[PDB]
Amino acid sequence: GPHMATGQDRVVALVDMDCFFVQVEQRQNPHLRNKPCAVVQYKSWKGGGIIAVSYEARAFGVTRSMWADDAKKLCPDLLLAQVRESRGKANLTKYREASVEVMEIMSRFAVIERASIDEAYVDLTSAVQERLQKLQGQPISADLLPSTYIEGLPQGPTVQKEGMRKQGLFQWLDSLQIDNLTSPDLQLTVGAVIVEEMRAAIERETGFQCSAGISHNKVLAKLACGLNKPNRQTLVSHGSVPQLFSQMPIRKIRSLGGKLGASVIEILGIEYMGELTQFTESQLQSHFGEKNGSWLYAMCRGIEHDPVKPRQLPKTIGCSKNFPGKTALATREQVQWWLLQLAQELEERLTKDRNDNDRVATQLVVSIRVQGDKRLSSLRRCCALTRYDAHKMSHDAFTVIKNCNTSGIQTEWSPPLTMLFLCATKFSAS
DNA sequence: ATGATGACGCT
DNA sequence: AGCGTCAT
Numbered sequence: 001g002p003h004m005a006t007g008q009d010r011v012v013a014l015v016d017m018d019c020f021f022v023q024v025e026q027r028q029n030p031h032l033r034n035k036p037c038a039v040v041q042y043k044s045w046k047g048g049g050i051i052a053v054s055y056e057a058r059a060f061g062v063t064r065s066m067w068a069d070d071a072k073k074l075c076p077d078l079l080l081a082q083v084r085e086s087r088g089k090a091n092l093t094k095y096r097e098a099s100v101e102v103m104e105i106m107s108r109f110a111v112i113e114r115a116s117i118d119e120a121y122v123d124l125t126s127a128v129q130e131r132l133q134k135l136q137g138q139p140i141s142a143d144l145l146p147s148t149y150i151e152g153l154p155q156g157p158t159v160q161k162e163g164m165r166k167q168g169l170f171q172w173l174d175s176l177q178i179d180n181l182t183s184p185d186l187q188l189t190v191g192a193v194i195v196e197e198m199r200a201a202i203e204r205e206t207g208f209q210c211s212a213g214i215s216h217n218k219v220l221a222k223l224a225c226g227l228n229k230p231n232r233q234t235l236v237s238h239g240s241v242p243q244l245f246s247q248m249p250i251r252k253i254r255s256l257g258g259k260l261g262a263s264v265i266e267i268l269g270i271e272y273m274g275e276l277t278q279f280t281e282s283q284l285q286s287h288f289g290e291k292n293g294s295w296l297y298a299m300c301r302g303i304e305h306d307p308v309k310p311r312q313l314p315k316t317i318g319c320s321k322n323f324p325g326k327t328a329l330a331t332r333e334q335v336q337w338w339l340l341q342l343a344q345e346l347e348e349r350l351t352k353d354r355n356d357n358d359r360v361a362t363q364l365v366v367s368i369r370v371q372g373d374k375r376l377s378s379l380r381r382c383c384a385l386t387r388y389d390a391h392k393m394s395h396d397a398f399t400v401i402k403n404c405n406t407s408g409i410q411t412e413w414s415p416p417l418t419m420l421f422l423c424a425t426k427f428s429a430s
Numbered sequence: 431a432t433g434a435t436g437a438c439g440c441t
Numbered sequence: 442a443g444c445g446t447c448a449t
């Protein structure tokens with residue numbers, strides 16, 4: 001009752017760019033706008049692997065991981081943009097720079113946690129308090145929320161999608177207690193107003209559209225963001241959680257999409273996130289461990305405490321290349337040449353990073369994969385990163401991997417290498 | 431033969 | 442430290 005925390009103390013938003021890499025290419029090439037189109041890498045193998053898909057192309061069934069030759073059978077007029085290739089490998093610089101454009105806009109409104117190249121969490125609790133003091137009990141107009149969905153509404157006693165959206169919004173705003181500055185529903189609503197303003201600023205200053213979720217924590221904000229895409233935002237209130245979770249497959253919740261969520265399903269014999277409420281904390285901790293059990297117990301009630309971390313920059317800068325099947329590297333010279341290619345791209349990104357962000361990496365992680373392993377990485381070893389020099393980093397990487405070579409012959413590499421990865425880590429201010 | 435990333439938990 | 446999970 002009066003002491004049972006409800007997880008309603010924060011306003012958290014997740015902003016996610018719609019078909020991000022596609023929008024980057026469509027901004028650059030107007031011929032691609034408003035068309036079925038996809039972003040591919042490496043044109044030689046089956047037209048390239050698709051890594052991003054516009055919503056027009058999704059209507060034909062085009063998905064990520066499709067080969068472009070196969071996608072073209074689903075969508076013969078599919079337009080494609082290729083990822084840049086430099087030093088024999090895909091180069092994602094254009095998308096990292098576009099990401100920076102968005103992240104810097106988002107940071108004008110609140111401190112962000114960069115979750116990915118195209119997603120950031122925002123803690124809006126303080127901005128909402130300030131905006132509420134500026135409103136002075138004044139009601140919130142539906143015109144301030146022109147692209148907001150209220151999850152779970154409309155409800156109770158028009159057949160077009162926007163009509164539904166407005167009906168639900170009207171019901172929400174009619175119900176709102178705007179005199180209570182500490183109503184969590186009011187705080188979420190003001191949050192949504194700010195997120196409308198943030199999304200409009202992103203679109204105005206970059207051309208990119210995004211979606212967003214507004215709730216009381218990161219998991220609900222992420223789930224909310226995906227409920228109405230593209231170019232929309234969804235408010236998921238605490239009160240909407242029981243109905244929303246009652247038919248929500250467990251794998252949809254962030255961190256349950258893999259083996260842990262599969263084990264929750266198998267071990268407990270359930271399907272939906274709401275079904276977790278019937279277990280005690282101790283039961284869940286017995287099955288999934290102390291941290292996971294506590295987290296599931298709170299999460300299935302809509303409660304989560306993972307804070308929005310103040311981090312706008314990536315913590316690592318990595319360069320990786322696969323060498324599949326027949327192309328696996330079998331000669332020592334092949335391994336040195338590719339390590340140098342990776343090291344040169346890494347040097348260039350690190351130098352840029354040190355000029356922009358006043359920091360230097362201090363550790364070099366080298367990871368390889370050998371032909372035969374099912375694991376994505378077969379061996380990871382670190383050394384000191386003391387100079388931003390590609391020839392030195394590639395030499396050191398080779399030094400810490402060269403004893404993996406099973407071969408008796410010096411010039412050969414066995415087993416051949418199917419993946420090389422160089423990662424700069426452990427940044428220090430400078 | 432998806433591939434190229436990136437964060438964080440466990441021991 | 443090195444390995445694994447989960448994600449974009």
Ligand SMILES: Nc1ccn([C@H]2C[C@H](O)[C@@H](COP(=O)(O)OP(=O)(O)OP(=O)(O)O)O2)c(=O)n1
Nearest residue numbers: 016017018019020021022051052053117118449
């Ligand atoms: N397995 C993946 C997932 C994503 N990406 C890249 C390309 C995507 O454009 C971008 C963002 O990924 P999302 O999962 O957010 O997907 P999109 O932004 O493409 O689409 P959506 O509108 O569904 O978010 O990251 C990638 O290279 N490989």
Ligand SMILES: [Ca+2]
Nearest residue numbers: 016017018019
């Ligand atoms: Ca996205």
Ligand SMILES: [K+]
Nearest residue numbers: 016116118119
């Ligand atoms: K994303």
